């Protein structure tokens, strides 16, 4: 048995993410994606 309700919560800002930084480490992209996005202006 389960049931719709109004809930209240403290909002999330995003996923948490530690960047793997080091004195001698680099990340380099091996591929790409072409992305198309709309922007709408009056």
């Amino acid at each position: 048995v389960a049931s719709q309700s109004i809930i209240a919560y403290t909002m999330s800002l995003g996923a948490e993410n530690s960047v793997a930084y080091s004195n001698n480490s680099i990340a380099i992209p091996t591929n790409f994606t072409i992305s198309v996005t709309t922007e709408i202006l009056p």
């Binding site: 800002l13 995003g14 996923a15 993410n17 960047v19 080091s22 480490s25 990340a27």
Partner: protein, 339 residues
């Protein structure tokens, strides 16, 4: 980036809970709803402005526990875990420079009665239906977005702006910035100790300047002062007679009957409704100036923090290397780093 949200009980401002004043106020039709709508429009926009300036990160980025960045010392602009709100050292100066007249949080009515109404204007404002609303993002919630923009920048350069964050050593990220201003990257690596010491001392001068001087955050304090002055002005116009025998609605209703009282009450309705229409027009005009500043601050965040700018003087006086955001009450401070 934003200004204090305000909501007004039009009915309570114009009529001090007089029912015969409220029945006269209905003769004017939708003007009270137009005022309420306009103020709701301004209030909803302050959250939009703040979201667009700060919420540019996909992820809440974190630095490693090893705080070494090629000799550059971000410890005064990174978040301090010892504070109950995790702001940086410099953000915790900026919050002392700008002093707010209300922030919209709970007053338990025990706060309002007795002595405090004699010494805090906020009570006169509240007792006349003028309410400051809270922002959607708390100052801790803005400090999170700011520490994520900053942690992304120092650990990954511009890469978190375009895609996923890609780590790069900070001295090599700074060498990219040197190539980007047309200085060959060996000029960084052959002078890295000097460049770090210059930067570390230049951040030291920001703390000294913010600790010593009174009015440098005047651009933010002036927003608080104008929104406070406007509400104090609006509550002053309750004292004005507008040609009635008294400004006090209860005097008229203690002394006149329900046909010659009305020509007094109608003057006060006419003048008080004009006082709100003036306030709301002034706030709609101010809100457009704050919007234009939030759009500039979001453009500065995009082009100076998430990138390196070729635009002259857009990211400070010099050739731009990088910039660091720090939050302030109703605003943002950019620390622009320039060669």
């Amino acid at each position: 980036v934003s200004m204090t949200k305000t909501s007004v009980d039009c009915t309570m401002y114009i009529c001090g809970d007089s029912t015969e004043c409220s029945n006269l106020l209905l003769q004017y039709g939708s003007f009270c709803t137009q005022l309420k709508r306009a103020l709701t429009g301004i209030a909803v926009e302050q959250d939009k402005n703040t979201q667009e300036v700060f919420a540019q990160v996909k992820q809440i980025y974190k630095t490693p526990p090893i705080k070494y960045f090629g000799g550059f010392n971000f410890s005064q602009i990174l978040p301090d875990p010892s504070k109950p709100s995790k702001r940086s050292f410099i953000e915790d100066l900026l919050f002392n420079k700008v002093t707010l007249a209300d922030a919209g949080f709970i007053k338990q009515y025990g706060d309002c009665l007795g002595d405090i109404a004699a010494r805090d204007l906020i009570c006169a404002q509240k007792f006349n239906g003028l309410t400051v609303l809270p922002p959607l993002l708390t100052d801790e919630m803005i400090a999170q977005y700011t520490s994520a923009l900053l942690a992304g920048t120092i650990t990954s350069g511009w890469t978190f702006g375009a895609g996923a964050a890609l780590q790069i050593p900070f001295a090599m990220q700074m060498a990219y910035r040197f190539n980007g201003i047309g200085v060959t990257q060996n000029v960084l690596y052959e002078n890295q100790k000097l460049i770090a010491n210059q930067f570390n001392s230049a951040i030291g001068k920001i703390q000294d300047s913010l600790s010593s001087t009174a009015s440098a955050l005047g651009k933010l304090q002036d927003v608080v002062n104008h929104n406070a002055q406007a509400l104090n002005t609006l509550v002053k116009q309750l004292s004005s007679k507008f040609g009635a025998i008294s400004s006090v609605l209860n005097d008229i209703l203690s002394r006149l009957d329900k046909v010659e009282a009305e020509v007094q009450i109608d003057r006060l309705i006419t003048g008080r409704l004009q006082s709100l229409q003036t306030y709301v027009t002034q706030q709609l005009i101010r809100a457009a100036e704050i919007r234009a500043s939030a759009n500039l601050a979001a453009t500065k965040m995009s082009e100076c923090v998430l990138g390196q700018s070729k635009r002259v003087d857009f990211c400070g006086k010099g050739y731009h290397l990088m910039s660091f955001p720090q939050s302030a009450p109703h605003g943002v401070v950019f620390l622009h780093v320039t060669y």
